[PDB]
Design a protein around this ligand. Structure first.
Ligand SMILES: CN(C[C@@H]1CCOC1)c1ncncc1Cl
Length: 165
């Protein structure tokens, strides 16, 4: 199971780790992807998870979009976890860099409540432009299921832990 995590709350855990390396090690039931509405896994966590699947995540995602159309910002879909996990929960947090409503971050985290345990990144953090400290706060105040957060950046991980209220 999950190792080396710092416990933040009853159900939220955090580790300075590469979520791809973490997923290949734990092979969790659910890995969360920091998805966009089109499931175009170009960069950030999505590009990294997709590259670890040898593009199989993108091929599967393009078929999902062809059938269903785009996701909503704040929405999600469950697809295969490929070689990383049993499932991948593709969750769309608001992209502040595209002017999306930061209030949708709580809706985005609510998707985690449908899964007993998840390996996840901080939604809307990184290239999505939101403040990761705010993302962690919304995560702890929204998610009730067991969430193991992987924060790639060591300096950000230290800032998140040291400032966690
Ligand atoms: C028991 N679970 C986990 C569910 C069970 C299957 O999907 C996740 C809960 N999750 C959130 N809030 C309350 C409860 Cl009781």
């Amino acid at each position: 199971s999950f190792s080396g995590y710092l416990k933040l709350t009853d159900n939220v855990y955090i580790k300075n780790a590469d979520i791809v390396e973490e997923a290949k090690k734990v092979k969790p039931t659910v890995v969360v992807n920091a998805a966009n509405v089109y499931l175009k896994h170009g960069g950030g966590v999505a590009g990294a998870l997709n590259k670890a699947t040898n593009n199989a995540m993108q091929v599967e995602s393009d078929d999902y979009i062809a059938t269903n159309g785009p996701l909503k910002v704040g929405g999600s879909c469950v697809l295969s976890g490929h070689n990383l996990a049993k499932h991948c929960l593709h969750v769309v947090g608001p992209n502040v860099n595209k002017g999306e409503d930061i209030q949708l971050l709580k809706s985005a985290y609510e998707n985690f409540n449908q899964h007993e345990v998840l390996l996840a990144p901080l939604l809307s953090a990184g290239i999505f432009g939101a403040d990761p400290i705010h993302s962690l706060r919304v995560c702890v105040d929204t998610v009730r299921t067991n969430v193991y957060l992987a924060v790639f950046d060591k300096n950000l991980y230290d800032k998140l832990v040291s400032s966690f209220l």
